[PDB]
Amino acid sequence: ANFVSWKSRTKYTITPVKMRKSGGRDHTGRIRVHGIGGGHKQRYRMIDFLRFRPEETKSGPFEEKVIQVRYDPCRSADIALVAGGSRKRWIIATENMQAGDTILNSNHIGRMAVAAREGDAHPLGALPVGTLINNVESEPGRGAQYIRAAGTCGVLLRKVNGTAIIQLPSKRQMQVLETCVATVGRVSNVDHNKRVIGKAGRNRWLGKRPNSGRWHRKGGWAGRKIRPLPPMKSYVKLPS
Amino acid sequence: FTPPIYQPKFKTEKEF
Amino acid sequence: AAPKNRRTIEVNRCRRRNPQKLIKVKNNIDVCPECGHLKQKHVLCAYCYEKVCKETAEIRRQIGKQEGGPFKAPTIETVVLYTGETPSEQDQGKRIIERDRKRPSWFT
Amino acid sequence: ARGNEYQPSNIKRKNKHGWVRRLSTPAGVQVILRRMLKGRKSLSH
RNA sequence: CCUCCGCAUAAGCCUGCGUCAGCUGACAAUUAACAGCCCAAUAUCUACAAUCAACCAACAAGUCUUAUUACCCUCACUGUCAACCCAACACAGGCAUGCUCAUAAGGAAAGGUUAAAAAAAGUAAAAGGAACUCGGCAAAUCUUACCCCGCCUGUUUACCAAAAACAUCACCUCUAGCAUCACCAGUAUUAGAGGCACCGCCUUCCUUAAAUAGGGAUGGCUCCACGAGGGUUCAGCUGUCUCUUACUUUUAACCAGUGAAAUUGACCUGCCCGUGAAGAGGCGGGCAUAACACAGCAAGACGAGAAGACCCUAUGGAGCUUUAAUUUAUUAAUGCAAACACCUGCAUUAAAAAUUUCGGUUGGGGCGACCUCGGAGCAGAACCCAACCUCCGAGCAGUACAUGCUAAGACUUCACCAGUCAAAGCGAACCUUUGAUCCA
RNA sequence: GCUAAACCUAGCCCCAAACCCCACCUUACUACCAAACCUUAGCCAAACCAUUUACAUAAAGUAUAGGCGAUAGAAAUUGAUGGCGCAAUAGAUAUAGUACCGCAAGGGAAAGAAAGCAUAAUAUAGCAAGGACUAACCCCUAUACCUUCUGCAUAAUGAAUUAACUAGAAAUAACUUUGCAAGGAGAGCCAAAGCUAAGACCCCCGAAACCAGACGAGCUACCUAAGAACAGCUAAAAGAGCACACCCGUCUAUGUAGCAAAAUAGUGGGAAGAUUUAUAGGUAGAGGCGACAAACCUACCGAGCCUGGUGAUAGCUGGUUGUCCAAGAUGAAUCUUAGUUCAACUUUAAAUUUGCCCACAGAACCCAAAUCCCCUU
Ligand SMILES: [Mg+2]
Ligand SMILES: [Mg+2]
Ligand SMILES: [Mg+2]
Ligand SMILES: [Mg+2]
Ligand SMILES: [Mg+2]
Ligand SMILES: [Mg+2]
Ligand SMILES: [Mg+2]
Ligand SMILES: [Mg+2]
Ligand SMILES: [Mg+2]
Ligand SMILES: [Mg+2]
Ligand SMILES: [Mg+2]
Ligand SMILES: [Mg+2]
Ligand SMILES: [Mg+2]
Ligand SMILES: [Mg+2]
Ligand SMILES: [Mg+2]
Ligand SMILES: [Mg+2]
Ligand SMILES: [Mg+2]
Ligand SMILES: [Mg+2]
Ligand SMILES: [Mg+2]
Ligand SMILES: [Mg+2]
Ligand SMILES: [Mg+2]
Ligand SMILES: [Mg+2]
Ligand SMILES: [Mg+2]
Ligand SMILES: [Mg+2]
Ligand SMILES: [Mg+2]
Ligand SMILES: [Mg+2]
Ligand SMILES: [Mg+2]
Ligand SMILES: [Mg+2]
Ligand SMILES: [Mg+2]
Ligand SMILES: [Mg+2]
Ligand SMILES: [Mg+2]
Ligand SMILES: [Mg+2]
Ligand SMILES: [Mg+2]
Ligand SMILES: [Mg+2]
Ligand SMILES: [Mg+2]
Ligand SMILES: [Mg+2]
Ligand SMILES: [Mg+2]
Ligand SMILES: [Mg+2]
Ligand SMILES: [Zn+2]
């Protein structure tokens, strides 16, 4: 198929980007994921998940003003347009982020624990043990990948050597170098769970479609079955 | 069902 | 229902050459003593009727030229006059349709 | 109800059965070659 | 007198009711302003819907470029017709958009006649008013109440099923800790899959005159609303019916024109009884019997339509499922070597699949029996004789270890295969049932 | 006397020889902008199927291979222009790869120089005739044909009818007739009268299928991009009510070779949404797509269509065309009882010598009819 991904923009921008829906199809044109299709037309707002991104010809911790907190069609969490120096960027808004607030993004691992104020981003080494965090990186400077959905909050369980143990919202532990940055507090839109879709049409607006034949293997869906051993073949299904 | 079979048009379009 | 056997030409002849199917000879045909044309006793002579229809059509064309437009039917009688004819006393007060030919013998 | 499966559109006609698409693949080139060998007046659609 | 018609655009088609002279040929024609055919780049830009956009109301969150550097020449090219396209057709079908909402546009239901049946559509109907019928189907007319199922709006077997089936919000379970082609430019309040079903709470009588109808005396319940769902009912309504009739239109029949299809061994093509490949126009015995049109009918021609439906067969297909058989080539895991993450070879286990098969005889109300060999009867007396026929028995043992070797002539399970008997001779001594070939 | 009949070359078949201006890959036929190579499979045979089979001469169908079975199968060595063709349903598909059919791949023609009727309907009764007769009918006799069956007028199959076309291909071994003859044969091979040569003998149509490679998402299913439509009333931001356009297709009737290969009329459901819909693009066949109906994927989808393998295979059905004569009829095994092989029967040819019938004699104990056997005849 003549499918070219719409994710071709190379330069970061604030403007919402016109994103092409996939319908759950590969570049080959065949369905790869089922139940996707239709829904409201959406525009993509490029989110900068590297919270500590010092501006060009600049370095060190910097502050930013929350221009606004906006609903994002492409996420559960709501985003914030936040401006610093002479640039603006979209970030993931925390629970109590408000327009006009100030946000601190630092790479300084202070000897003492920095007072953890919701919304600011510090290296994990600088946080008190047990602080709620989100937008966690796996590697230093990789960019936030974990704890990004609405209302999610990991916990900085432990800090030893240059390694911190985080509890992801799935209650699984993760080891990350303490130099990797994370933002304090739980992600915004904490009430995302309680939202009631109400009708099938609303899911269809959200781009979820009812789709059958989701397996494509011979016989369709087949739950795993325990294959008996020769000794147990005699008792697999004892007639009543 | 079996589809109808059409006979060639030349047979019925002949003219003197 | 479909035929159970092809009908033979002998049966078909017995059917389609029956007198009921044959054309009957007409015996009401005669000669019009006026013009000698053939006519049926109860029907008008075709040739004479054609004469009358053509003359009527010409007279009606003259009437249409005189009236000049739809919905102009006169409220007065009409009289047709041919070349060399003059409105008579009883033809007074009647619209005159003038024909360029001479009075037909059958027209009185 | 049926029978009118052909809904003509010159764009689809040319994009689907045209000379350019026929030459776009070796299989289509062989389609053209077969038509040429048979002597078809119309090699492509 | 009639029309959701008409005029344009789009799309499609491609000269396809313009003129002329004989459907054919010739001749003519649609003229750009409408429409199409575009843009010199590099970068940098571009958070703030729309809905009369002002309040108000949100959620589904919603087409949004200047600076600099180059550059002056100018209106080319193409579509323009029609009664038109997709449906084999001058096809009652399909066919986007803008305006006209009954037309200022566009059209003609009747070839002529007659006024039969049957048939279609419609109108009216005494009294009655569901007695019709599977069912109030259809029609006519207003309504009541209640059950079953599914929560709901939706979807589906294009062309016999629109439903209680599918989906669905809700809920539960399982799997996944992660980025540059889907999921996703997402990240556990996420994503994928499966199940379930909104939600919420606990663990003989009545109906009728007559009632095989209807209603009521994790699980158990709760039906708010909805439904061309499935049942029952009051009232009304009615030609559904008692019980049909009248009229109009179509059809019809006659006249004129044009003119098919299935079908058809030949037919000079009767009835009764009998017979027969078991249902006779055709044969036997009787009866009847001039010859032909036309209109009706549907009892027969085991009437015509598809080598119908259903059932059985074929060492015929194909689909599906598996603890049917054979594989793991391919992927995924591991392990061992091989190169110092990636990759090759070899094994093992899986996943996914792939190929192939469906023995025979018997048994209608079962839950199987049988399949080879032998004895007895059927089959009495040479031999031979079946069965889902009536009974019985066997898959070897005991013995010895000439129970060795050879060899005339014979028998033979109706073929062959196989299976039997055996003189003489040599050698020791002094016997009474199961199965081939190949392959090992 | 109409329709018609006829015709002969247009060409073709098999051999031999010879090696044969301009426009156009963009939406082809449009003057001019910044990347190829990779085992065929399967039908089929094995009577299923699974390994397997199935894409000069001579040595020799030998060595070999092989569910050692169907079958497959060497090499060393040897050395080597014409027509008892067609002649317009034939011969090329061909007047043309045109017309026409199909979206496409692709399929693919035709043709040029008697029957049926009419002259002239018809006569009791009957397979339509025959025996006849003075005489057409009247009289008497007479149950179409083919195929499939134990048996068919059968109310079993096929056939309207005419013309044309349309179906028995071959080995091993025999036999017959020649040649030569312990040798024959024009190397090879055979030979204990053989060898050499000739003569005679082995059908047609038909599946559902399987696989390879193409072609198809202008219908339909779903999806992508960017569009468009939704009156009026009621209600207020609604998968809201009634109801147009629009979409659908509940029920009834009509239609059923129809207006229509799914329609018409009425009735009915939705009708601001999970709506409907134009345009362009995508997903492709064991695949796609699917609010799972086995639904849809160009009218016939439990797996499309086309071409090829392919003249698939068919123990099954049907068909199998001059004359005449003669002989000619009821067990065993088998994935076998719709078939086949052996036997029995049958036919032909040949050799030589008993064959059938058949009395007497003869053939069991246990517990009838007859049969067997054979001197004579
Ligand atoms: Mg369409
Ligand atoms: Mg008319
Ligand atoms: Mg009429
Ligand atoms: Mg009444
Ligand atoms: Mg009743
Ligand atoms: Mg009532
Ligand atoms: Mg009754
Ligand atoms: Mg009704
Ligand atoms: Mg429902
Ligand atoms: Mg249907
Ligand atoms: Mg539908
Ligand atoms: Mg229906
Ligand atoms: Mg009742
Ligand atoms: Mg509904
Ligand atoms: Mg007529
Ligand atoms: Mg009888
Ligand atoms: Mg008969
Ligand atoms: Mg009659
Ligand atoms: Mg049959
Ligand atoms: Mg024997
Ligand atoms: Mg086979
Ligand atoms: Mg050699
Ligand atoms: Mg020819
Ligand atoms: Mg003749
Ligand atoms: Mg018959
Ligand atoms: Mg039969
Ligand atoms: Mg027949
Ligand atoms: Mg499409
Ligand atoms: Mg409205
Ligand atoms: Mg609504
Ligand atoms: Mg659907
Ligand atoms: Mg189902
Ligand atoms: Mg089913
Ligand atoms: Mg099809
Ligand atoms: Mg065959
Ligand atoms: Mg004889
Ligand atoms: Mg066997
Ligand atoms: Mg058989
Ligand atoms: Zn006269």
Residue numbers in the entry:
A (entry chain D): 61 to 300
B (entry chain d): 41 to 56
C (entry chain 0): 79 to 186
D (entry chain 2): 48 to 92
Lines quoted from the article behind this entry:
The human mitochondrial ribosome (mitoribosome) synthesizes 13 essential subunits of the oxidative phosphorylation (OXPHOS) system. The mitoribosome is composed of a small and a large ribosomal subunit (mtSSU and mtLSU, respectively), which each contain a ribosomal RNA (12S, 16S rRNA) and a number of mitoribosomal proteins (MRPs). Biogenesis of the large ribosomal subunit (LSU) in all translation systems proceeds through distinct steps in which the formation of the peptidyl transferase center (PTC), the active site of the ribosome, represents the last and most critical step and requires the assistance of assembly factors. In human mitochondria, the GTPases GTPBP5, GTPBP6, GTPBP7, and GTPBP10 mediate mtLSU maturation, as their deletion results in a loss of active mitoribosomes and stalls mtLSU biogenesis at distinct states.
Thus, two distinct mtLSU biogenesis intermediates accumulate in the absence of GTPBP6, one containing MTERF4-NSUN4 and one additionally containing GTPBP5. The structure of the second mtLSU intermediate reveals the structure and function of the Obg domain of GTPBP5. GTPBP5 binds above the PTC and interacts primarily with the rRNA. The GTPase domain is poorly resolved, but the density indicates that it resides between uL11m and the sarcin-ricin loop (SRL, h95). The Obg domain extends along the PTC and contains three conserved loops at its tips (loop 1: residues 93–103, loop 2: residues 140–145, loop 3: residues 191–205)18. In the GTPBP5-containing intermediate, the PTC adopts a more mature-like conformation in which the PTC loop forms the base of h89, and the h80 tip is shifted upward. First, GTPBP5 and the NSUN4 tail disrupt the interaction between the PTC loop and h80, which allows the PTC loop to refold. NSUN4 sequesters bases G2817 and G2814 through stacking interactions with W31 and Y27, respectively, and GTPBP5 binds G2816 through stacking interactions with F92 and sandwiches A3089 between F100, A202 and F92. Second, GTPBP5 stabilizes the refolded PTC conformation through backbone and base interactions with charged residues in loop 1 and loop 3 (R97, K98, E95, E99, and R201). The cryo-EM reconstructions show density consistent with 2’-O-methylation at all these residues, suggesting that GTPBP6 acts downstream of MRM1-3 and GTPBP5, in agreement with previous data.
